[PDB]
């Protein structure tokens, strides 16, 4: 059984903005290597850390949450997401990145993820991605 948290709430899916999450699956071929989103004080400020290519980089995004929907902004760049699946204990979740041809991402806790729940997120990402190639950004010499 892989029934997640219902109704899906983005604030609950991110452990109420108290835990760091890592990008582990993505249908976007330009997905950031070793991407990790973590709390950056206090809308909801988020610090994104990633690699491009050998050197580490970091940017400050501002999240605006409303139910399952998540709007992230950096300067004048805007990205819209919807948390389409969240596991029982908020250990992982799957986002639909809203654009002309939507992408799907799997995010999981940087530390303390329950295997059965993480596997349910992997299956939900497989279902939504279907045959589209799934990048594993956390396996890029992180
Ligand atoms: C209070 C801490 C919150 C941590 C939660 C992190 C990710 C959740 C996940 O569902 C949402 C991800 C949103 C990503 C938004 C933008 C990224 O594409 C930016 C990548 C880095 C960049 O290119 O600058």
Author numbering: 23 to 64, 69 to 168
Give passages from the manuscript.
The ligands are also of different lengths (C16, C18, and C20, respectively, for palmitoleic acid, ricinoleic acid, and LTB4); LTB4 fills the pocket completely, whereas the yOmCI-ricinoleic acid and bOmCI-palmitoleic acid complexes show a water molecule filling the bottom of the pocket. Hydroxylation at this position is common to ricinoleic acid and LTB4, and both complexes show the -OH group on C12 forming hydrogen bonds to His-119 and Asp-121. Gln-105 recognizes the -OH at LTB4 C5. The C9=C10 double bond present in LTB4, but not in palmitoleic or ricinoleic acid, stacks against the guanidinium head of Arg-107. The same Arg side chain is the source of the selectivity against cyclic eicosanoids such as TXB2 and TXA2 (43), as it makes the pocket too narrow to accommodate cyclic ligands. The hydrophobic side chains of Phe-36, Tyr-43, Leu-57, Gly-59, Pro-61, Leu-70, Val-72, Met-74, Phe-76, Trp-87, Phe-89, Arg-107, and Trp-133 contact the hydrophobic body of all three ligands. The three ligands all bind with their carboxylic acid head at the solvent-exposed brim of the OmCI pocket, hydrogen bonding to the side chains of Arg-54, Thr-85, and Trp-87. The other main locus of structural variability in the bOmCI and yOmCI structures is the conformation of the βH-α3 loop (amino acids 132–142), shown previously to be required for C5 inhibition, which in both complexes of bOmCI swings inward, with the concomitant flip of the side chain of His-117. Dispersion interactions between the conjugated leukotriene and nearby amino acids cause the shift, which is consistent with the triene chromophore of LTB4 being completely encompassed by OmCI.
OmCI is a bifunctional protein derived from blood-feeding ticks that specifically prevents complement (C)-mediated C5 activation and also sequesters leukotriene B4 (LTB4) within an internal binding pocket. The 17-kDa lipocalin Ornithodoros moubata complement inhibitor OmCI, originally isolated from an ectoparasitic tick (Acari), is a bifunctional protein that may have such therapeutic advantages. By binding directly to C5 in the vicinity of the C5-C345C domain OmCI prevents cleavage of C5 by the C5 complement convertases, thereby preventing release of anaphylatoxin C5a and formation of the terminal 5b-9 C complex (TCC). We describe two crystal structures of bacterially expressed OmCI: one binding a C16 fatty acid and the other binding LTB4 (C20).
